[PDB]
Amino acid sequence: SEPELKLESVVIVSRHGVRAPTKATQLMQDVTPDAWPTWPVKLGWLTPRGGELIAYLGHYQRQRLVADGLLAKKGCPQSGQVAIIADVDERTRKTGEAFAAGLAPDCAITVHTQADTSSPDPLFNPLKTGVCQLDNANVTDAILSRAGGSIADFTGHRQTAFRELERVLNFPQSNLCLKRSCSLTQALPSELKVSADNVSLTGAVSLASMLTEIFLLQQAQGMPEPGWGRITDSHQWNTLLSLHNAQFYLLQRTPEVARSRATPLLDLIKTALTPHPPQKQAYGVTLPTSVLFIAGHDTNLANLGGALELNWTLPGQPDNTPPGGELVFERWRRLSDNSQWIQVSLVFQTLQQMRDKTPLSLNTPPGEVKLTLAGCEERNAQGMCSLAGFTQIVNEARIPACSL
C-alpha cells in the first residue's frame, strides 16, 4: 500500500575480534607494582575465543538476514551473494573467517585481502601508504580545539578517570612513584604529535588509552580478576574506558583527520550501497551484492563516525568501538514507489555477553543502537535517510585526493 520496505543490501564494517595484547613494555611494568597476567595465545593475534565471539555474531546475522528474507534459511548462499573483505593483518583475516564460519558453517566463503599481506592495504588507511596527507596546521588547530584548548586542559578536566585508573594500578606503589603528590598525568606529560601521515598523543593519555583497553580485553577473554580484581562494578568500567574513548575522540573522530582516513571506505560503502548492474570491483569482488562484510579496526569505525556525523554510546559496552563491533549500513526499497532508504546502526556484544560468551540468536540478540545521520534532512518514519541524502552526505565528506 505505502509504508512497506524490503531489505535489498547490507554492508557491515566490523572491527576485528579480541586480540591478545603485545608483550608488556617497561613503561607498563613501571606504572604498577603488580605483574601483568600473560596471554596463552600468540601475542597480537586473534584469540580463539575472540574468533568464537565473532562466529556468534555471524550466526546472529544469518538468522536475522533470513528473517528479513535476504538469505535462504538453509544451505549456502549463492556464489557472490556474500562477500568478505579483510585488512591484511592476522586478526582481521581470521575475523573475516570466523564471521563466515558463523554465518554459513561448512560453506566455502572466501576472505578477500590484498595479495601482498606484508604491506599495508590503503583501503584501511590511505595516509599510511602516502595516497594523501593531512594538513598539519588545520589538524593541529582542530584537535587542540576539541580538546578544550590544550592537552593540559583536556587532561585536567578528566582527573576523575585518571584517578580511577591510578587506583586500579595501585599507582602510588609503583617504581614510577617510588623512584620519583604522585600524579599519572603529571608524571607522563602528554603532547600532540601531528605529521603529514599521522597524529598521536604521548604520555599519560596514550598510556591510559592503551591500559584501559587491556583491562576490557582481559574481561572479554574470560581471564579471572581483570585489573587484579580492582574493577568490580559497571561504573568503574565506564569511567576507565572513558579515557580510551577520549583519545579516539581526539585522534580518530576529529573531522579534519577522519574524512581523509576514511575516504577509501566511504567510496566502497557508497558503491556497495548504490543499486547498479553487478561488476568486478576491488579484490575481484562483485558489487552490488547481498551482504558485504569488511574486517577492519576500531580506528576505521571512529573515522566513519566522525566523517558521517554519527555519534553513539553503547549501553553495556564501555568501549565505543568494541572488538567485533559492527557499523551496519542497509539499503531498503519502498515497494510502492521504488524509493531507496539507508539505515545505519551499531551492532555489538555487551561486555557481559563477551564475558559469559553467551550465544546470540533472534531471542537473545547482541546489543544494538539505531543511528541517525546528523546531516540528513530527507528521512522516513523509521529514521532512515534517502539514498540521495546519504549519497550527498558521502560526496561532501570524502576527500578527493585520498581516493584510491
Per DSSP, the residues of 271-326 read: HHHS----EE-GGG-EES-SEEEEEE-HHHHHHHHHHHT----BTTBS-SS-TT-E
Helices (H) and strands (E) in the chain, counts: 14, 12
For residue 246, say whether it is annotated as part of any ligand binding site: no
d(CA 404, CA 356): 42
Indicate if 298 belongs to the active site.
yes
Q: How was this structure determined?
A: X-ray
- Find the catalytic residue in 16, 59, 121, 267: 16
CB 104 within 8 A of CB 76: yes
d(CA 8, CA 29): 52
The answer to whether domain 134-252 has CATH 3.30.365.10 is: no
Start and end residues for every CATH 3.40.50.1240 domain found in the chain: 1-133+253-404, 134-252
For residue 129, say whether it is annotated as part of any ligand binding site: no
Indicate if 356 belongs to the active site.
no
Strands 192-195 and 5-15 turn out to be unpaired
Here the cell at position 85 is 573483505
For residue 146, say whether it is annotated as part of any ligand binding site: no
Q: What are phi and psi of 272, to 5 degrees?
A: -70, -35
Here the cell at position 320 is 565505543
For residue 62, say whether it is annotated as part of any ligand binding site: no
Rounded to the nearest 10°, the torsion over CA 344, 328, 242, 49 is 160
- Find the catalytic residue in 87, 89, 121, 298: 298
Please name the residues in contact with 155: beta carbons below 8 A apart, sequence gap of 6 or more. 162, 185, 190, 204, 205
Question: b/e for 269-299, b at 16 or more Cβ within 10 A?
Answer: bbbbbbeeeeeebbbebebbbbbbbbbbbbb
CB 340 within 8 A of CB 331: yes
Here the cell at position 402 is 585520498
For residue 92, say whether it is annotated as part of any ligand binding site: no
Superfamily for the 1-133+253-404 domain: Phosphoglycerate mutase-like (3.40.50.1240)
Instruction: Report the candidate in 14, 13, 101, 112 with the shortest Cα–Cα distance to residue 59.
Output: 101
CA 221 from centre of chain = 18
d(CA 370, CA 345): 4
